[PDB]
Structure 1
Amino acid sequence: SKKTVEFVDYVNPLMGTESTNTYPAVAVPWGMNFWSPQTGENGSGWMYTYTDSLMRGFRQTHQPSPWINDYGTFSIMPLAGELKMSHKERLVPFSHQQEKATPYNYSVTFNNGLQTSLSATSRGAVFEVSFPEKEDQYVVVDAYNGGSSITIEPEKRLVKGATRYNNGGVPDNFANYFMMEFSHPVIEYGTYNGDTLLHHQTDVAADYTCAYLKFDVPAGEKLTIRTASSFISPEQAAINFNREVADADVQLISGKAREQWNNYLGRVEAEGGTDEQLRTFYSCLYRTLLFPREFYEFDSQGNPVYYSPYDGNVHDGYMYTDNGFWDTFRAVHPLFTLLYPEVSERVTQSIINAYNESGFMPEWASPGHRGCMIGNNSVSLLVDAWMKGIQTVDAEKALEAMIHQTQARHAEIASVGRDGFEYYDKLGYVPYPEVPEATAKTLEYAYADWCIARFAESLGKQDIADQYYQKAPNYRNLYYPEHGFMWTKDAKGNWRDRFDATEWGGPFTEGSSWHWTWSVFHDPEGLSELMGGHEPMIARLDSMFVAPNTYNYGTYGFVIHEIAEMVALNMGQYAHGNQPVQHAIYLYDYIGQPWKTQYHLRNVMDKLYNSGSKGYCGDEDNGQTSAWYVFSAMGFYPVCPGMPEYAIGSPLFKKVTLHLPEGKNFVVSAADNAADRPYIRKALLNGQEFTRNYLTHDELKQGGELNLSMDSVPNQQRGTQPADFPYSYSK
């Protein structure tokens, strides 16, 4: 039902774009090609930075992060006045006051008065350009370096080309083939090979190539540019072009993208919250619907096909990419399993496809295998989906791929397969200094093995399930009882010298023992057994969330209370956004104090997020917490993917409605919610008293209502019983 302010209207694509990371992607959900303004140099992962004041182009991009960087990329830049060819020299001043960034349309007016907006489809885009009067009118096409080509057909108003730039993870025959068409006659044109501007030349191929077109659009008219591309072939690019953007103007493509975003965003309806909260919520949701990208295309017969970034051939079916599972297994894919399961259907398939095409399941992919991060979290995606009834892959084939991922490793890429599997099988842990990041690896492997065991168990293969369950407690092998933290051992069982809870690097990944000690999401109870019981575990958790200490200064009033909290954060005992601790706040649900979960969660949502350009304020938060926020605001979180349960937190809005498959709807209502009322005093699940600290996937899936009475003080009787705790392997 149409509203005055629609879901997409709340999205700020510039959220996370300052203190630079993020670019303001124009796209449709999971679209094969994204578009973005570019302020950084060609080659820089820092494509758009809020504090930059000079624009160089509008990029077709696939970049999942600055570190990973881009591939298959080219840009279009309209210019007024002086012609500049190289990205080093195309620098056009603009102000954010004349910039309007939305997922369905990006629009900007430069200081010289040139106006341009662009909107994207899955694989194409359309620009409108309004040129300042009495100035020369150009469009420059930059096809990047790495060995590219451009062909202009000026009488047809066409430009085509191929871009091959990449940052690895591509087969030998890699290229993106693109095509574009202009609405007005091309008066003059030329090419550039990185060294010389060649007027009148239509065809160019070199390391770095660009082309210019010169127009004479009459006063009052706008130039339209239509473009599309393909990883398969120039023929397929034209197929994409004709299906998605031929004859369209920007308003048409804008309207369709806008509708697509409202459809997908609207699967969760948040109501009763501030505009700021709504903007934060929907902006995080928008970010969550971008990755992995679809990497398939529809052929002349309308059937899905794809260029495999794993073997370089064209196949029938589905493929996705631009994802590190180490990141996305935790909350992004679980969100898909719940609200967008048709995506998980194709993603899980695509994982087996990559395995069939390369010998291994992907872990970090962009486009193909990339050496990045750790773990076998591809397994988590398959298994989490499976236990939720999403079963599009063949069971035996999936199981074989899982086992192999744990029993082999890519010859040169450490992150592909299981780095250190020999040691881990023999010793029960991965040793350090023999293997980099050994302890974090051990912890991740123990979870993956628990996943495979769960998977085999669900198939009836009890022998194989027992083997893997044997490994699920492997986290115990690295717990140092004297100090009460995870640590590391070498291959002979010797603890490493000079224990230091806060020391980064070495056997840990992007963190210290302070963070990694919590990485046992399949067995919180077992972790508490190591620590001495729920009571010591609670004290240890309590210690991570340092409270403000004002001493006797409160006298100066509550102003004293505010400044104190900054500092307590400003030293950061729990680093919000650090992966291995993202679930940690929910752990109180497992050990009898859910009110603490309720309190800390609502504190974090209020204090470390906003919808502005610095929106992820957590020092360790660069936007990877988007899905964590979406779940947390809804009131629950998938602490342990592979177990179809969501731990209960505390909702941010008075109401959320999840529109699920088969006309089912699940409502979390909290009619008395407010900023000072984070606690759940009482709860009814479909009208019945409800004291569990978790919802099962099936309870959400079948539709219904969780009715919460919110309060300003904790209810210390509720959710304190063993029947109330979610799953642990060692229960």
Structure 2
Amino acid sequence: ADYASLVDVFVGTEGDFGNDMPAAQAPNGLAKVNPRTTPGRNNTGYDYAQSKISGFTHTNLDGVGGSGGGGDLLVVPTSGSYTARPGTGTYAHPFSHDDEDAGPGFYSVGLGNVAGTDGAITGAPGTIEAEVAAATRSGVHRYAFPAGSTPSLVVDLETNNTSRRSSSVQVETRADGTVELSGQVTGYFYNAAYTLYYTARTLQPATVQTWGDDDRLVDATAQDGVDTGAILTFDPADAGEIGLQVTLSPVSVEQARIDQQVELGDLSFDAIRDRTRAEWNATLGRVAIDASTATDPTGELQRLFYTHLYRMFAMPMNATSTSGTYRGVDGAVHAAQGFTYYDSWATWDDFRKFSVIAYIDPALYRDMVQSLVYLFADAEATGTGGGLGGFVHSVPTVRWERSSVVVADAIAKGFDGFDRLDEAYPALQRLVGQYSADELRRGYVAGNPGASVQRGYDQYGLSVIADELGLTEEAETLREQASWPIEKLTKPGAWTAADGTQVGLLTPRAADGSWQSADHAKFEAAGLYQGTLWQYHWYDAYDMDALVEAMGGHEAARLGMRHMFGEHAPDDGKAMLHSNANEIDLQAPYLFNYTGEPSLTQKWARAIYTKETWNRYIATGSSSAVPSGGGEFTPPLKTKVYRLDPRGMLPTMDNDAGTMSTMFVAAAVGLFPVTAGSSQFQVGSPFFDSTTITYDDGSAFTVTADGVSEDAFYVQSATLDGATFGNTWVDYATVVGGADLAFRMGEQPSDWGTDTAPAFSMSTA
């Protein structure tokens, strides 16, 4: 019943080992009440390895790179006093993980008391007990200050994980003496600025001073600039209980006030915390697991599952008001009619995650795709022709590449009635871009194999959308162009197998058709972003059949796949050409199903996600967190990719809006989307004796793995709804239809699935 207790919100919160947050948050919540460590932090604002905390920020992004996004609206409890804008060093409180507790919807910590005046503020006797919880749009605070303290909360509106652009604060003192603060914060992350409106009320009487960009702390009730803030001071008689409620809205301050009355009403802190815990239990309860001692002797694998299921329901965030409105990239308010509008995208990294969301929470997935459609429809509506990067966004956000694939994913899966798809389409076309004249002639971008394979997948996705809109002729042209990267950039005999077999591989190609020299295993060679040619080779996952042919046939592919995973040298870390640390070749472990060796897919799926593997590659050039260089672990390292630890992922391995977590869930269920933008899932190695996904109507998908253990991870035989099943892929319809997929597991590889009906490929469909 209480799945929330199995989630460990600290997994991935250390250093550069995931960039996730312990923040109090509701499922897909906008409000993310994250403690802030000092002087070090991860991208979210909390590094587990630290021992001081300043306060709580209310906005954020999960698992992103750079210096993180959001981090707006810092609330810092203190017994100190100020006569000017606070020095940030004065916020610092000792904390200990021994006096810290968190889980779905809540975070609590005992902070060492601090007192004094301005720069003289330092440690003081006693403890500030801090508790926060979250609803969808709101963060609530309860503080206990030592007896005799003059409690104060600093509301710092400059704090941002990357860049504060503008902020404002208006103060109101009501009849009962409580204070309400409101205004806007405008930040920036990666491509775009974003604005959020806020309202924050105290629950006890307070007096207040504000500051603006001149650093003067004054009695004025309004500020508007870049660095602004407010300092709330309470009566010592209220030291036992200081409460604060903060609500966010992409729409307006007054909308935030309405949202707050709707969301929180007169509910107590405990009831708001309790209600969000129940909401998490309902969300997590969509997947019910029975895991024997044999497969999970310590219970950590089940905790790991639920922790990553928790992480899967974070982004995109609910960007809709309680009144059913949202703010568009045109800067105006619009109705999200009959659906919830979500926003905050990092689709270049995360596109495969949506395909998995589709089979865990179909209704949420539908709303997300509809939202993605409205977002592009809105860009088109401006009439400006500009890219999404040129607008101010409704929530912190990242990037939008591969959106065409995600939309196509819902269409291929039989979702329809997507309002405003006709409007979204031309904006999706501009996103994807066109080959230049010279590029059209030759069939590829000169010296840029990465951009070529990427457009190929984008064009496949657009082609699905084109056919749905009845643009048949456009769809044909798109499919033709989408075939080009495979045909034109797979260089024959790029790699020669041990027995002489000639294997073709993605290789940069000059304008005149000459092949360009390249080490196919070198990180970021040939203009590639965050990967190698071997890793990008497999990118055009919508046409494995054409890829197998371009590679030089079945045997060439089969031997290539074996070499990709160093099968000929299992104890040599350097022979590992696959990367676990980035999303570029996420699907690669499941490609053995395509080379007639499904047992190897099963092995690698179970190994990468639940065992120690060889790791040659990190996700970036180098990292101070592990001896590394040139995009590699130096030397290669045998280690678990996923740990139930604050050091949750490999060093440099960012979750990226819950992508790595979502892939873990998919591996655990045993169904992986090699082809996002299709309706198919590839069979892996289900982790648990029984896994049940219950849909909103009470029907359920049940996948069983009879006799599964840490050693018994190979499929021996299978049935589908009682009947012999021999395919290594299943359709989305079969899953959400409530099928019974039953596997028989064993400790040795079998030939199960080696006579599979072919999986989807654009060229053979």
* Both structures adopt the same fold (TM-score exceeding 0.5): yes
Match of 1:538 among 555, 558, 571: 558
Is 1:477 aligned to residue 488 of structure 2?
A: yes
Is 1:488 aligned to residue 514 of structure 2?
A: no
Is the CA contact 1:85–1:212 (under 8 Å) kept in the aligned structure 2?
no
Question: What CA distance in whole angstroms lies between the structure 2 residues aligned with 1:686 and 1:362?
Answer: 47
SS for the counterpart of 2:744 is strand
Question: What CA distance in whole angstroms lies between the structure 1 residues aligned with 2:567 and 2:509?
Answer: 34
Larger mean CA deviation between 227-236 and 619-628 belongs to 619-628
Show the counterpart of 1:643. Answer: 678
Cα distance, 1:507 vs structure 2: 2.6
Is 1:353 aligned to residue 349 of structure 2?
A: no
SS for the counterpart of 2:476 is helix
Is 1:609 aligned to residue 631 of structure 2?
A: no
Give per-residue Cα distances to partners, 1:568-599, cap 9 Å, x unaligned: 55885321142221001111111211100011
Cα distance, 1:58 vs structure 2: 0.4
Is the CA contact 1:158–1:182 (under 8 Å) kept in the aligned structure 2?
yes
Show the counterpart of 2:14. Answer: 18
Cα distance, 1:168 vs structure 2: 5.9
Is the CA contact 1:73–1:163 (under 8 Å) kept in the aligned structure 2?
no
Is 1:102 aligned to residue 84 of structure 2?
A: no
Is the CA contact 2:378–2:424 (under 8 Å) kept in the aligned structure 1?
no
SS for the counterpart of 1:57 is strand
1:548–1:481 CA distance, 2 compared to 1 (3 A):
closer
Show the counterpart of 2:545. Answer: 525
Question: What CA distance in whole angstroms lies between the structure 2 residues aligned with 1:55 and 1:43?
Answer: 10
Is the CA contact 1:456–1:462 (under 8 Å) kept in the aligned structure 2?
yes
Is the CA contact 1:86–1:210 (under 8 Å) kept in the aligned structure 2?
no
Is the CA contact 1:177–1:231 (under 8 Å) kept in the aligned structure 2?
yes
Is the CA contact 1:443–1:520 (under 8 Å) kept in the aligned structure 2?
yes
Cα distance, 1:363 vs structure 2: 7.7
Give per-residue Cα distances to partners, 1:263-295, cap 9 Å, x unaligned: 111111122144211111111111111001121
Question: What CA distance in whole angstroms lies between the structure 2 residues aligned with 1:481 and 1:372?
Answer: 37
Unaligned runs of 5+ residues in structure 2 are 114-126, 159-163, 495-503, 612-640
Is the CA contact 2:522–2:532 (under 8 Å) kept in the aligned structure 1?
yes
Percent identical across equivalent pairs? 25
Question: What CA distance in whole angstroms lies between the structure 2 residues aligned with 1:690 and 1:702?
Answer: 17
1:200–1:295 CA distance, 2 compared to 1 (3 A):
same
Unaligned runs of 5+ residues in structure 1 are 409-415, 433-437, 551-563
Larger mean CA deviation between 444-453 and 510-519 belongs to 444-453
Is the CA contact 1:334–1:384 (under 8 Å) kept in the aligned structure 2?
yes
Question: What CA distance in whole angstroms lies between the structure 2 residues aligned with 1:504 and 1:640?
Answer: 24
SS for the counterpart of 2:88 is coil
Q: How does 1:392-471 map to 2 (within 5 A)?
A: 392-394=417-419, 398=421, 401-402=424-425, 405-406=428-429, 408=430, 416-418=431-433, 420=435, 422-432=437-447, 438-457=448-467, 462-471=472-481
Is the CA contact 2:346–2:397 (under 8 Å) kept in the aligned structure 1?
no
Is 1:80 aligned to residue 82 of structure 2?
A: no
Is the CA contact 1:32–1:296 (under 8 Å) kept in the aligned structure 2?
no
Q: Normalised by the size of structure 2, how large is the TM-score?
A: 0.83
Name the aligned partner's letter for residue 613 of structure 1. Answer: P
- Number of paired residues? 685
Name the aligned partner's letter for residue 616 of structure 1. Answer: M
Q: Normalised by the size of structure 1, how large is the TM-score?
A: 0.87
Question: What CA distance in whole angstroms lies between the structure 1 residues aligned with 2:334 and 2:379?
Answer: 13
Question: What CA distance in whole angstroms lies between the structure 2 residues aligned with 1:76 and 1:141?
Answer: 5
Question: What CA distance in whole angstroms lies between the structure 1 residues aligned with 2:386 and 2:343?
Answer: 12
Cα distance, 1:459 vs structure 2: 6.2
1:233–1:404 CA distance, 2 compared to 1 (3 A):
closer
> Over aligned residue pairs, what C-alpha RMSD do you find?
2.9
Cα distance, 1:515 vs structure 2: 0.9
SS for the counterpart of 1:333 is helix
1:116–1:134 CA distance, 2 compared to 1 (3 A):
same
Question: What CA distance in whole angstroms lies between the structure 2 residues aligned with 1:388 and 1:545?
Answer: 31
Match of 2:145 among 111, 120, 131: 131
SS for the counterpart of 1:703 is coil
Is 1:158 aligned to residue 179 of structure 2?
A: yes
Cα distance, 1:258 vs structure 2: 0.5
Larger mean CA deviation between 539-548 and 85-94 belongs to 539-548
Show the counterpart of 1:685. Answer: 720
SS for the counterpart of 1:491 is coil
Cα distance, 1:249 vs structure 2: 2.3
Match of 1:669 among 683, 704, 719: 704
Q: How does 1:50-449 map to 2 (within 5 A)?
A: 50-64=48-62, 65-67=64-66, 69-71=68-70, 73-81=72-80, 85-112=86-113, 113-144=127-158, 145-155=164-174, 156-167=177-188, 175-186=195-206, 188-198=207-217, 200-218=219-237, 221-272=240-291, 273=296, 274-299=298-323, 304-308=324-328, 310-317=329-336, 319-330=341-352, 332-359=353-380, 367=393, 375=401, 377-394=402-419, 398=421, 401-402=424-425, 405-406=428-429, 408=430, 416-418=431-433, 420=435, 422-432=437-447, 438-449=448-459
Give per-residue Cα distances to partners, 1:493-551, cap 9 Å, x unaligned: 3333455442515431211102101112111122121222222222222223236969x
Larger mean CA deviation between 35-44 and 154-163 belongs to 35-44
1:254–1:362 CA distance, 2 compared to 1 (3 A):
farther
Question: What CA distance in whole angstroms lies between the structure 2 residues aligned with 1:362 and 1:260?
Answer: 36
SS for the counterpart of 1:667 is strand
Give per-residue Cα distances to partners, 1:178-230, cap 9 Å, x unaligned: 222222222x4322335445354433334212221222354783222122122
- Which structure carries more relative contact order (alpha carbon 8 Å, separation 6+)? 2
Larger mean CA deviation between 605-614 and 702-711 belongs to 605-614
